[model samples]
Target: GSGNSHTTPWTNPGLAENFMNSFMQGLSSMPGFTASQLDDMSTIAQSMVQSIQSLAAQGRTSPNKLQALNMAFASSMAEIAASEEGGGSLSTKTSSIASAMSNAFLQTTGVVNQPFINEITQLVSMFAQAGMNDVSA
Candidate 1:
């Protein structure tokens, strides 16, 4: 048991591991994605895992942490999505990660997953719009 009694979905190594596996599957399907882009996504995924593990360690077990985590996750994704290297907008591949993460979290907790999807969608839209502005200038 690793001598750890505290357990939550966030702390479950399997969930995070599975999430990353499926996440990379979706990410790799995008056309024209560079090795560097995948590396950046991997780094963000690692950060998300650390954030979840740390939040779990802090005794925060509520699903609300999903909201916070998704915000951070979406923000990171948006940064990459808007970067020149990432083509400066949300790719279908990038948007799919929100759905993938939401599905995993919902199946784990039986909580509504739309909030996670919604936050990510909104951020992607915001970043896409900002990119449009940059191009129009």
Candidate 2:
């Protein structure tokens, strides 16, 4: 699903910019609001993704194609997840499960990366934390 280019999804940059605007608005209102903080965090997130792609591309089977695919997947995921705070968890879970199933079906996949395992663990923990906080608030 990540590399599929059939539908030309995330074709508009405005959708992503609007998503960044809304996410910052929600983050700013939650518990602590500080000037320059939102902008700084946004910059960091953007930079990290760019840097990760660059690094990932260095050893990619096709560097330019991989970079483009990475951007498209990232943008598509962000666009879908930005629809709501919980949308991210839903998408992540769905994708993870589907990916696992696909790998099993193919019978060609090997052990997934430890970093991926750690990242998903942290994300699931955060989703639970966010849920608890929402209930309390």
Candidate 3:
């Protein structure tokens, strides 16, 4: 479902941005939110996608478009967590989102670097841990 301008189903930046905004907004909310933090997270997420495209244009060692796009979204979760806590730390929600996006990347790309694989493993493990924590309560 991903592609270039020549494809029938092409990558539309406008739609992608809308999807990004909608997806992030659907994530569970937290208290003490502010407009500035929300805007920063949105901007960062968008910029991350653009950075991925740029990386692709530059070299192959960079993540493929799909993986980079997923990572960008995954990184947005971290950005939100940092903004909420005023420090860099990931919580259950972050890991949940990360695992979902990382799985998506793996499914789409079919292959990935070891670091990405490790990150995905950690996220899935955290997700399982959080689920157990909830069930035990």
* C-alpha TM-scores of all predictions: 0.56, 0.27, 0.38
Q: How many residue pairs collide in each prediction?
A: 0, 0, 0
lDDT of 3 by residue, 67-118 (tens): 4565556554544544343332345544445444444333433333346535
Clashing pairs in 2: none
What do the candidate models score in CA lDDT, each in turn? 0.57, 0.38, 0.45
Q: Which scores higher on TM-score, 2 or 3?
A: 3
Off by over 4 Å in 3: 1-19, 28-36, 49-63, 79-137
Among these predicted structures, which one has the highest lDDT?
Answer: 1
**Candidate 2 per-residue lDDT over residues 1-137, each given as its tens digit:** 37744311122232222333333444444322233434554564465346544654564434345335434433433332232233235445434423432232223122322343344334433444345434655
Model 3 weakest lDDT span, ten residues long: 6-15
Q: Is candidate 1 or candidate 3 better by TM-score?
A: 1
Please identify which of the two predictions, 2 or 3, would achieve the higher lDDT against the true structure. 3
Model 1 clashing residue pairs (backbone)? none
- Judging by lDDT, tell me the better candidate of 1 and 2: 1
